């Protein structure tokens, strides 16, 4: 995944109304119990999903089982660890714990380690201080691979979307209730509001009609439209700025 | 749009220009009102060029048609490209006044 | 104390959209177009 | 259609504003939009699916 | 003059007008976090003109 | 807004007037986010703290949750060591949700914001480490998420390539915040709720320190506190 | 790109200095994203 | 303001309901005797949408259960996997 | 209304019986599992 959430075009988890009279429904809070039940179940599952991982010729045959699961060690790196050929990540961790046991960092003060006899033997260095980044870098060098045989001589998204779609249908009927309800509360100041706003929305939708193809190519925009007055009055302003 | 019937318009416009461009340049008039002026043998009556001016306003306006188109392109796309600073019912609409407010939101500073 | 000073260059673009992504390219050219003319004064 | 315009928002508001006033006078029917979302045979099928989920979980 | 003839293939005069009544308005941004994050803040709205419900309702009455 | 964020029938908000109220409270939270550091002497019954934790239990805006968390973090700056609104008004329904946002691995600004308020919460540490390590899911999410948040967006040397043949030298932004709270959680002395947590996490952190050599310079106070 | 004539307690260069401090932050904010 | 090709345009190329509704609402807001007839008309319509409301809500409780039942069987797997 | 009312009245009893029974079986699976989790960490 990303470092940011992924935006989507279908709605995601639409709201539930609370101004609805719950004496009639009596199921919003019980449905609310299901959502916090599902989220806690989703909380435990996502925590569990996070916590489940937290001339004489020679015979040379490149075998089938050449694998890096048991990778070979250098003999210096072998005796500092103790194991013969375990792995590369166990080689890093046993090296890091061996420095942490001997307390070589400090008593960069933590990057520079106090190079002991074995640490100078396994790295073939002779400094007194050396950073741990270059210490673990040679572990990538000090490990050799295993030698071959030598012989010489979903549905939940659409279920969520349907639930998101059905919750949108719930938001419609709740708002359709409350308008007539507040119109039953006040028939005056929602119809005066209606007769103004529907008149205002009739104005806004009728603000884009004189901008068609053959409506501008003809001359019934400029000539005699002082009743319009909208354009052909800006020519005293648009020419004064050089817009032409 | 519809460029099939757009050629059928411009084929009548170019029909008219090629018909105006075959008239002789020495075209003159004669009104029935010159007998009150008593024109002599050489008097140069002032009604001689009342057909010649009208035939050249017609011929030259049929060539500056794409010239007023460019001005009307620069006129319509200058008065309508704003559309919400002069028109009152559009700048007093809820969605436009909120959007002009929303684009002027300055960024929040962290700490 | 009065100081008749020139106001700052305010990026007022002719066509006025409402989504932000059609503004940043002209505003970044404005920041290049204003700070480079301001750097030479220093 | 994924975006909305100022033309699209006002047409969405005005069509929704005129239909609620068209219900008080009842010169529109709006019966197809009622019973298809009620769907009382689905509502008992919702109940019967709730009734079997009592029986299955007990 | 430098005028072109009006029997030119530009005789259109309305091609890229784009009235501001057809401009796209910033609406609510429904986000997605994962498949098993149902306690995340499901959307984002910084300067949106409409709410997520009516923008979903417009989506419902279109899809 | 507390009438609607709780859902109170007191002042039932008209559905036609909701859009006028949505952008209105968006700029109110921005004003509250900027002046919260000047009311940093927060009171016990701080009405701004009391309402905002009731608002935080309601919204689904990613931006609004961030602005509430930044205000509450910057309201509790110079609070106390004994008694302010942090110790009691966190009703553990909010407090179990802030730790739950660390499970949101896709987002990362919400991880930083949930870590920063809890860091501002944990700074007394007396009634705070014990409160943050209280429940069977708040003291248990951090046992899995907080060790995993150290190697967030950090190029660990991989071994799937090394198993199928047939070093980052850096940190991230949230890893610097993750070691900062965990070292202060290692400063939970006398083996309270933090060092007893910090002893069952030290066997897991030691595997992370071998892959990232910048995790040796960091987590120094933690390694001194084991 | 619209200028203005106004009165200020700062002189012209300090406004240009305040323009330097304001535009450089906006330059760093916009180039980063 | 010159019609030049306007003849060539003309050569080649040769509601009431909601007005009376807006008239009728103007009549309802004069006599308040109709406002009671309109409020009581809206209130049974308000009751009509209440019956519309819970018939959707009684579907949502059911549909939440099967999606939850998708996570019971997911949770019941962890009874055996963790105990392994 | 009557066919709607018949399955709007019986349903809420079947709603709140099932949701409460869902609260029983889920929390019983929780307390079994959150105690099985503790025996792992030892």
Curated annotation (Swiss-Prot), chain A:
One of its GO terms (molecular function) is structural molecule activity. SUPFAM superfamilies: SWIB/MDM2 domain. It is found in: Nucleus. One of its GO terms (biological process) is positive regulation of transcription elongation by RNA polymerase II. Keywords: Chromatin regulator, Nucleus, Transcription, Transcription regulation. Gene3D superfamilies: SWIB/MDM2 domain. One of its GO terms (cellular component) is nucleus. To yeast SNF12. Present with 2470 molecules/cell in log phase SD medium. Interacts directly with RSC8. Component of the two forms of the RSC complex composed of at least either RSC1 or RSC2, and ARP7, ARP9, LDB7, NPL6, RSC3, RSC30, RSC4, RSC58, RSC6, RSC8, RSC9, SFH1, STH1, HTL1 and probably RTT102. The complexes interact with histone and histone variant components of centromeric chromatin. Component of the chromatin structure-remodeling complex (RSC), which is involved in transcription regulation and nucleosome positioning. RSC is responsible for the transfer of a histone octamer from a nucleosome core particle to naked DNA. The reaction requires ATP and involves an activated RSC-nucleosome intermediate. Remodeling reaction also involves DNA translocation, DNA twist and conformational change. This is Chromatin structure-remodeling complex protein RSC6.
Curated annotation (Swiss-Prot), chain B:
Interacts directly with SFH1, CSE4, histones H3, H4 and H2B, and via its N-terminus, with RSC8. Interacts with LDB7, NPL6 and RTT102. Component of the two forms of the RSC complex composed of at least either RSC1 or RSC2, and ARP7, ARP9, LDB7, NPL6, RSC3, RSC30, RSC4, RSC58, RSC6, RSC8, RSC9, SFH1, STH1, HTL1 and probably RTT102. The complexes interact with histone and histone variant components of centromeric chromatin. Belongs to the SNF2/RAD54 helicase family. Present with 1990 molecules/cell in log phase SD medium. The chain holds residues 187 to 297 of 1359 of the full protein. The gene is STH1. It comes from Saccharomyces cerevisiae (strain ATCC 204508 / S288c) (Baker's yeast). The lineage of its organism: Eukaryota, Fungi, Dikarya, Ascomycota, Saccharomycotina. Catalytic component of the chromatin structure-remodeling complex (RSC), which is involved in transcription regulation and nucleosome positioning. RSC is responsible for the transfer of a histone octamer from a nucleosome core particle to naked DNA. The reaction requires ATP and involves an activated RSC-nucleosome intermediate. Remodeling reaction also involves DNA translocation, DNA twist and conformational change. It is found in: Nucleus. Disulfide bonds: none annotated. This is Nuclear protein STH1/NPS1.
From Swiss-Prot, chain E:
The gene is RSC58. This is Chromatin structure-remodeling complex protein RSC58. Component of the chromatin structure-remodeling complex (RSC), which is involved in transcription regulation and nucleosome positioning. RSC is responsible for the transfer of a histone octamer from a nucleosome core particle to naked DNA. The reaction requires ATP and involves an activated RSC-nucleosome intermediate. Remodeling reaction also involves DNA translocation, DNA twist and conformational change. It is found in: Nucleus. Component of the two forms of the RSC complex composed of at least either RSC1 or RSC2, and ARP7, ARP9, LDB7, NPL6, RSC3, RSC30, RSC4, RSC58, RSC6, RSC8, RSC9, SFH1, STH1, HTL1 and probably RTT102. The complexes interact with histone and histone variant components of centromeric chromatin. The chain holds residues 252 to 314 of 502 of the full protein. Present with 4460 molecules/cell in log phase SD medium.
Swiss-Prot record, chain H:
It is found in: Nucleus. Disulfide bonds: none annotated. Present with 3380 molecules/cell in log phase SD medium. Dimerizes via the C-terminal coiled coil. Interacts directly with HTL1, NPL6, RSC6 and the N-terminus of STH1. Component of the two forms of the RSC complex composed of at least either RSC1 or RSC2, and ARP7, ARP9, LDB7, NPL6, RSC3, RSC30, RSC4, RSC58, RSC6, RSC8, RSC9, SFH1, STH1, HTL1 and probably RTT102. The complexes interact with histone and histone variant components of centromeric chromatin. Component of the chromatin structure-remodeling complex (RSC), which is involved in transcription regulation and nucleosome positioning. RSC is responsible for the transfer of a histone octamer from a nucleosome core particle to naked DNA. The reaction requires ATP and involves an activated RSC-nucleosome intermediate. Remodeling reaction also involves DNA translocation, DNA twist and conformational change. This is Chromatin structure-remodeling complex protein RSC8. It comes from Saccharomyces cerevisiae (strain ATCC 204508 / S288c) (Baker's yeast).
């Amino acid at each position: 995944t990303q470092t940011n959430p992924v935006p989507v075009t279908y709605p995601t988890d639409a709201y539930i109304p609370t101004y609805l009279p719950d004496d009639k429904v009596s199921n919003l809070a019980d449905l609310k119990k299901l959502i916090e039940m599902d989220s806690r179940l989703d909380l435990y599952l996502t925590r569990r999903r996070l916590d489940t991982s937290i001339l004489r010729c020679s015979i040379t045959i490149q075998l089938r089982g050449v694998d890096g699961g048991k990778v070979q060690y250098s003999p210096n790196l072998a005796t500092l660890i103790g194991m013969q050929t375990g792995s590369v990540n166990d080689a890093v961790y046993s090296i890091y714990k061996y420095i942490l046991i001997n307390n070589l960092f400090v008593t960069p003060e933590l990057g520079e380690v106090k190079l002991d006899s074995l640490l100078q033997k396994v790295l073939d260095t002779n400094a007194a201080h050396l950073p741990l980044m270059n210490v673990v870098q040679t572990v990538n060098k000090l490990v050799s691979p295993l030698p071959p045989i030598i012989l010489d001589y979903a549905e939940d998204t659409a279920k969520l979307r349907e639930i998101t779609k059905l919750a949108l249908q719930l938001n419609s009927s709740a708002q359709k209730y409350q308008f007539f309800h507040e119109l039953s509360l006040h028939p005056r100041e929602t119809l005066t509001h209606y007769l103004w706003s529907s008149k205002q929305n009739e104005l806004v939708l009728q603000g884009d009609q004189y901008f068609n193809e053959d409506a501008a190519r003809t001359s019934d925009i400029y000539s005699n439209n002082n009743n319009d007055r909208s354009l052909m009055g800006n020519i005293s302003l648009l020419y004064s700025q050089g817009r032409l | 749009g519809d460029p099939d019937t757009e050629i059928r318009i411009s084929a009548r416009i170019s029909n008219r220009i090629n018909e105006l461009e075959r008239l002789p340049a020495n075209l003159g008039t004669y009104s029935l009102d010159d007998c009150l002026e008593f024109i002599t043998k050489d008097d140069l009556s002032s009604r001689m060029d009342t057909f010649k001016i009208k035939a050249l306003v017609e011929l030259k306006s049929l060539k500056l048609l794409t010239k007023q188109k460019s001005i009307r392109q620069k006129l319509i796309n200058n008065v309508a490209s704003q559309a919400h600073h002069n028109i009152p019912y559009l700048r007093d609409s809820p969605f436009t006044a909120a959007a002009q407010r929303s684009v002027q939101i300055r960024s929040k500073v962290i700490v | 104390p009065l100081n008749w000073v020139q106001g700052p260059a305010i990026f007022h673009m002719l066509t006025s959209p409402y989504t932000q992504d059609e503004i940043i390219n002209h505003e970044m050219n404005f920041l290049k177009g204003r700070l480079l003319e301001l750097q030479e004064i220093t | 259609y994924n975006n909305v315009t100022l033309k699209n928002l006002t047409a969405f508001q005005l069509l929704s504003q005129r239909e609620n006033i068209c219900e008080l006078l009842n010169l529109v029917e709006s019966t197809e939009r009622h019973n298809s979302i009620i769907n009382p045979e689905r509502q008992r099928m919702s109940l019967e699916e709730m009734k079997k989920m009592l029986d299955a979980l007990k | 003059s430098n005028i072109p003839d009006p029997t030119l293939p530009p005789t259109e005069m309305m091609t890229r007008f784009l009235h501001p009544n057809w401009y796209a308005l910033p609406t609510t941004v429904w986000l997605k976090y994962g498949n098993y994050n149902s306690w995340a803040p499901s959307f984002n709205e910084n300067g949106t003109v409409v709410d997520s419900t009516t923008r979903g309702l417009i989506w419902l009455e279109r899809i | 807004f507390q009438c609607v964020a709780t859902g109170d029938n007191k002042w039932q908000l008209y559905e036609g007037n909701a859009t006028f109220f949505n952008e209105l409270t968006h700029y109110t939270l921005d004003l509250m986010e900027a002046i919260s550091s000047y009311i940093a002497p927060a009171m016990k019954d701080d009405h701004y703290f009391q309402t905002l934790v009731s608002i935080l239990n309601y919204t689904k805006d990613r931006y609004m949750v961030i602005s509430i968390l930044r205000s509450l973090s910057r309201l509790l700056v110079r609070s106390k060591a004994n008694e302010e609104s942090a110790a009691d008004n966190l009703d553990h329904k909010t407090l179990s949700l802030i730790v739950s946002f660390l499970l949101l691995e896709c987002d990362s600004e919400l991880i930083i914001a949930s870590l920063d308020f809890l860091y501002q919460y944990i700074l007394p540490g007396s009634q705070r480490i014990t409160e943050l390590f209280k429940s069977k899911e708040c003291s248990l999410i951090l046992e899995a998420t907080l060790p995993n948040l150290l190697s967030y967006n950090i190029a660990t040397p991989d071994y799937h390539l090394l198993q199928k043949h047939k070093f980052p030298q850096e940190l991230s932004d949230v890893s610097k915040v993750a070691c900062t709270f965990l070292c202060l959680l290692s400063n939970d002395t006398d083996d309270g709720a933090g060092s007893a947590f910090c002893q069952r996490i030290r066997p897991l952190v030691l595997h992370k320190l071998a892959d990232i050599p910048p995790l040796t310079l960091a987590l120094s106070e933690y390694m001194e506190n084991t | 790109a619209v200028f203005d004539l106004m009165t200020s307690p700062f002189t012209q260069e300090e406004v240009l200095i305040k323009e330097i401090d304001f535009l450089k932050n906006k330059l760093l904010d916009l180039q980063s994203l | 303001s010159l019609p030049i090709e306007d003849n060539y345009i003309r050569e080649v190329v040769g509601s009431k309901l909601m007005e009376c509704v807006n008239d009728a609402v103007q009549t309802l807001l004069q006599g308040d005797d109709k406002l009671g007839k309109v409020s009581d008309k809206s209130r049974e319509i308000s009751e009509k949408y209440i019956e519309e409301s819970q018939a959707i809500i009684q579907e949502l409780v059911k549909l939440t259960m099967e999606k939850l039942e998708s996570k019971f069987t997911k949770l019941c797997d962890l009874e055996t996997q963790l105990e392994m």
